[PDB]
């Protein structure tokens, strides 16, 4: 077993509390659920959760519920035997069976339609699945990890989500603090991305940061917590392109005209 | 050429005009459309056209355009010279070719799927149908006569029926008057149907028709066609009994609860 | 230099060429705001042909051509005949050109699912095949050409916000033709010379004043396509070099 730290920057305040909380979740074999705003680095913690587990050697596979071909949904979810339907030349492993002893990443559960909800409703509680066109059933043990973007209790009262599935995946929820609220690691994230970008453009060194840039950072609403901060840092440092001085202007939106 | 033995029982003085019209079409090889409604005996007219043509000695296959399979359409229409088994000494014949030398009758034209529509349109305009496999075109000579009951102009307007094959296959149409339009032959059909029923049930004798029964079946809007009238007579004659008294009761529809 | 076609005296063209020179080395996603007929697969060629590597295949040919189920197969192909309609393995389009760059035309038309799949593929490089097998990772640059406002059609929610921000790392808009003022005669001359060479004319006789007024009055919806057709058709209908051209074929489909 190793550390599997991967990329960890800007750890302070409630983010450190979240890391401390998730540190001990990996030994447990109960489903987990992560709530957070879009692009709040949710996958990073979800991935690290698998590596911190004792059975970290299990293969890691990810599916996104927003991208499910409705025609191939059942086959992809469960698995199809050979010759079950026409055109099935060989036996093909399903996604659930693909991971055994390894975690499965689920995404966009808030966008999960009732169809996928019903098809997946039972394979979780008992870990039991039978392939389409299958004669005998298979049993597997997989730790489910889920990420979402909306208020699942709200969708439950709205009626487009099943409380059965919700409580099937509601042991514990991790609330990622949005960076625009933490406001304590924006400098560190920005400077880290700045060093990475200035290094990969093969420039000698990165100059400092302009005080006006810091002034205008905190003012922005930042819908992109840590997915547009990196992008804006990269684009602005590219715009400057020199170690001449700390960049005074940040190009917050690329759509803005050059003049 | 030889007038086949069929029941047309025509006295309406409009059916006679339709008969003369179709008889004029008997020799010609041009495509023919039969326009009618439910029932109306269009199959008899189509058989009359095929069987009083010069090519009457030819075959008279009649395909149900609703009954052709989707995937198997090409092989069904054309055939494959290759046998079903290795070293086969023969092949299955397609719908086309099996018609060469005679007329091909088409029915339920409106409900024909778009695949059937587009596949059939190409073959008629040029012929030269080729079976799957090989590169040898075979030239065919087939007369087309079709009958339908829907409104193909409306089908064209919706676009669920291609207008091009219609235009190619609408050289001339024959109009069939409904039974309510005829309104004069009802006695003779009623009697003929009853006489046939007499043998079918093995009833000994026809009892006769009452004036009330005549009035009721005559005074009907008749949305149903000749076959509906046929079934009517069939129901009443059986419900009547053993002909010890003249037939008195006609049940128009066997659905009222009573 | 590929003859460096379509030379622009426009300061906007000069500055956009200057930027494309800078985006040439780095493997970052470039989004080109070029209306239809405006720089259509004209600067993406320069971007692939000025990058660090030019050996990577440049197939491009991505459009709104296919519906969602057909565009899916176009992008990623099939998993070794795993399912109906597949007799063999079709690597698709991402695997088709590896180590180079691809191009997208009318990506705004693309369905929500393939938008999101582009999101999942661009970051890591892994390509989950349609069959469901293990994902294979490839390194390819992406250039995207649209014609409409993405902020609006993400305001309606039709674009994934993550995809818009991630793919639109750096935008490069283009000058439309009607803003181009003094280069219209330059384009007319250049196209006329190329046309007279391709029809093996001895030389070009020149323009006239009525024709110049016509090339001043029109609107020209297409930046290149609209006028190249007009000028080549006019010179072809002229079919001579003794007399300077005076007839202009505005629309090829006018009656009589």
């Amino acid at each position: 077993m190793a550390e599997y730290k991967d990329n960890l920057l800007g750890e302070a305040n409630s983010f450190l509390e979240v890391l401390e909380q998730v540190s001990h979740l990996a030994p447990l074999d109960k489903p987990v659920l992560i709530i957070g705003e879009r692009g709040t680095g949710k996958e990073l913690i979800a991935s690290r959760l698998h590596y911190l587990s004792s059975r970290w050697q299990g293969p890691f596979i990810s599916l996104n519920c927003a991208a499910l071909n409705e025609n191939l949904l059942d086959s992809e979810l469960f698995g199809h035997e050979a010759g079950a339907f026409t055109g099935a030349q060989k036996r093909h492993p399903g996604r659930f069976e693909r991971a055994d002893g390894g975690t499965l990443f689920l995404d966009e559960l808030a966008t999960a339609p009732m169809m996928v909800q019903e098809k997946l409703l039972r394979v979780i509680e008992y870990g039991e699945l039978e392939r389409v066109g299958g004669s005998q059933p298979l049993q597997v043990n997989v730790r489910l990890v889920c990420a979402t973007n909306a208020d699942l209790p709200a969708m439950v009262n709205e009626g487009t989500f099943r409380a059965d599935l919700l409580d099937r995946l509601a042991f514990d929820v991790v609330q990622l603090p949005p960076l625009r609220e933490r406001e304590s690691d924006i400098m560190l994230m920005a400077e880290y991305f700045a060093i990475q970008m200035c290094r990969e453009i093969k420039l000698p060194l990165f100059p400092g940061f302009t005080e006006r840039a810091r002034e205008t950072l905190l003012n922005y609403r930042w819908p992109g917590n840590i997915r547009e901060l990196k992008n804006v840092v990269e684009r602005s440092v590219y715009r400057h392109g020199t170690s001449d001085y700390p960049l005074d202007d940040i190009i917050i939106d690329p759509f803005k005209r050059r003049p | 050429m030889a007038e086949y033995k069929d029941n047309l029982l025509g006295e309406a003085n409009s059916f006679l005009e339709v008969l003369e019209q179709v008889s004029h079409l008997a020799p010609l090889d041009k495509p023919v459309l039969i326009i009618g409604e439910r029932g109306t005996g269009k199959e008899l007219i189509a058989s009359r056209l095929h069987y009083l043509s010069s090519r009457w000695q030819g075959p008279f296959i009649s395909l149900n355009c609703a009954a052709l399979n989707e995937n198997l359409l090409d092989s069904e229409l054309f055939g494959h010279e290759a046998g079903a088994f290795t070293g086969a000494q023969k092949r299955h014949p397609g719908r086309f070719e099996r018609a060469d030398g005679g007329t091909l009758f088409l029915d339920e034209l409106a409900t024909a799927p778009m695949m059937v529509q587009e596949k059939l349109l190409r073959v008629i305009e040029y012929g030269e149908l080729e079976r799957v496999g090989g590169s040898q075109p075979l030239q065919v000579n087939v007369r087309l006569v079709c009958a339908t009951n829907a409104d193909l102009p409306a089908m064209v307007n919706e676009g669920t029926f291609r207008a091009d094959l219609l235009d190619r296959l609408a050289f001339d149409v024959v109009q069939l008057p409904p039974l309510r339009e005829r309104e004069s032959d009802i006695m003779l059909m009623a009697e003929y149907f009853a006489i046939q029923m007499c043998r079918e049930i093995k009833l000994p004798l026809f009892p006769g028709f009452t004036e009330r029964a005549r009035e009721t079946l005559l005074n009907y809007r008749w949305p149903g066609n000749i076959r509906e009238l046929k079934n009517v007579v069939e129901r009443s004659v059986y419900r009547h009994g053993t002909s010890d008294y003249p037939l008195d009761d006609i049940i128009i529809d066997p659905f009222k609860r009573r | 230099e590929y003859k460096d076609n379509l030379l622009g005296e426009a300061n906007s063209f000069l500055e956009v060429l200057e930027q494309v020179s800078h985006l040439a080395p780095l493997d970052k996603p470039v989004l080109i705001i070029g209306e239809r007929g405006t720089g259509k697969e004209l600067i993406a060629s320069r971007l692939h042909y000025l990058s660090s590597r030019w050996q990577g295949p440049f197939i491009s040919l991505n459009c709104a051509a296919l519906n969602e189920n057909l565009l899916d197969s176009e992008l990623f192909g099939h998993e070794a005949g795993a399912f109906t309609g597949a007799q063999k393995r079709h690597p698709g389009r991402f695997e088709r050109a590896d180590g180079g760059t691809l191009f997208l035309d009318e990506l705004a038309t693309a369905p929500m699912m393939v938008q999101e799949k582009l999101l999942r593929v661009i970051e890591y490089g892994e390509l989950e095949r349609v069959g469901g097998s293990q994902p294979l990772q490839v390194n390819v640059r992406l250039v995207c050409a649209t014609n409409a406002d993405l902020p609006a059609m993400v305001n309606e929610g039709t674009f994934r916000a993550d995809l818009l921000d991630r793919l639109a790392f750096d935008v490069v808009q283009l000058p439309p033709l009607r803003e181009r003022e003094s280069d219209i005669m330059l384009m007319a001359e250049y196209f006329a010379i190329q046309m007279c060479r391709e029809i093996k004319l001895p030389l070009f006789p020149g323009f006239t004043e009525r024709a110049r007024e016509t090339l001043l009055n029109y609107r020209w919806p297409g930046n290149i396509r609209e006028l190249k057709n007009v000028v080549e058709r006019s010179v072809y209908r002229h079919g001579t070099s003794d007399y300077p051209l005076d007839d202009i074929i505005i629309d090829p489909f006018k009656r009589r």
């Binding site: 025609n71 191939l72 | 290795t86 | -």
Partner: peptide
């Protein structure tokens, strides 16, 4: 673009047990 049970012939074949014996008769040395 679907999963559906379909059918279309382009091939032919046939065989009997004694024909199988006759075709395996030529697999072996003299």
């Amino acid at each position: 673009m679907k999963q559906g049970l379909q059918l279309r012939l382009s091939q032919q074949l046939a065989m009997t047990p004694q024909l199988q014996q006759a075709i395996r008769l030529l697999q072996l040395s003299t």
